[PDB]
Design a protein around this ligand. Structure first.
Ligand SMILES: Cl[C@@H](Cn1ncc2c(Nc3ccccc3)nc(SCCN3CCOCC3)nc21)c1ccccc1
Length: 265
């Protein structure tokens, strides 16, 4: 069959970590040694499910969650590297939140940008970029997840969605850039919901009129400016992820060489 295929007895499902309507997510072990994450399809979605993990077989990048193995006959199991810290959202909101300062948060943003730069140059579109869908491991490693497979399973995050995508279905790498700007506010507020106190309908009406979130407290204006570039009305005017990565990687030398730590950032 396939070199990614593994026998069912090589997988040991240990701790259940997530529940869905179409399947489950587990932590476990592969070949008795390798710590892994496991998704199951409930025999729910068609056998088009495997067309998505075929993408995961094609895509390979240090900042994308790495496919390890598949069980492609029903009931299907998908195995990837294990991200010990869960979602970025949970990480930012939990015990680690209060310790993270701008240097850590901007480095995490740089990693996410690097993953998204790979997506960009491969001509993919994520469609649901936000902190809930980023995974965190040891040493503050951050990775983009199974965006294609997650998109298939998901068939409303309009606070993270560019107006042209939310209104006219134009989902592009550029609407992903918009989402990345929103993700930057998640980082700098340590996981707070964007547009605080606004309902979905308010957000749509306001963003249309040109409203953009203001500079978060203690966030340098230069980083809020970067967010504003990501939130440009014209998608083609928004920066590339290649530009975002470079800007974020060089931030504390080229952009804020006089940064001083504060109470929260
Ligand atoms: Cl399971 C692990 C996070 N993680 N690591 C890999 C991985 C992973 N890799 C993968 C595996 C098969 C097919 C596609 C992708 N997928 C996921 S999706 C689970 C997200 N879920 C985590 C629990 O809370 C609700 C949201 N989460 C993952 C985790 C560790 C500690 C706490 C919570 C989750």
């Amino acid at each position: 069959k396939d070199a990614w295929e593994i026998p069912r007895e090589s997988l040991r499902l240990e701790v259940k970590l997530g529940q869905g309507c179409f399947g489950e997510v587990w932590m476990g072990t592969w070949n008795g040694t390798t710590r892994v994450a496991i998704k199951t399809l409930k025999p729910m979605s068609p056998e088009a499910f495997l067309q998505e993990a075929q993408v995961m077989k094609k895509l390979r990048h240090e900042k994308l969650v790495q496919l390890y193995a598949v069980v492609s006959e029903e009931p299907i199991y998908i195995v990837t590297e294990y991200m010990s810290k869960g979602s970025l959202l949970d990480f930012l909101k939990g015990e680690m939140g209060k310790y993270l300062r701008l240097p850590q948060l901007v480095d995490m943003a740089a990693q996410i940008a690097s993953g998204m730069a790979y997506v960009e140059r491969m001509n993919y579109v994520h469609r649901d970029l936000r902190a809930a869908n980023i995974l965190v491991g040891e040493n503050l490693v951050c990775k983009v997840a199974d965006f294609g497979l997650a998109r298939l399973i998901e068939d409303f995050p309009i606070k993270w969605t560019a107006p042209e995508a939310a209104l006219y279905g134009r989902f592009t790498i550029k609407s992903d850039v918009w989402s990345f700007g929103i993700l930057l506010t998640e980082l700098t507020t340590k996981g707070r919901v964007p547009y605080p106190g606004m309902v979905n309908r308010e957000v749509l009406d306001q963003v249309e009129r040109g409203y953009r979130m203001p500079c978060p407290p203690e966030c340098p204006e230069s980083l809020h400016d970067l967010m504003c570039q990501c939130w440009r009305k014209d998608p083609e005017e928004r920066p590339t992820f290649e530009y975002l990565q470079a800007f974020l990687e060089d931030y504390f030398t080229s952009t804020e060489p006089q940064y001083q730590p504060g109470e929260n950032l």
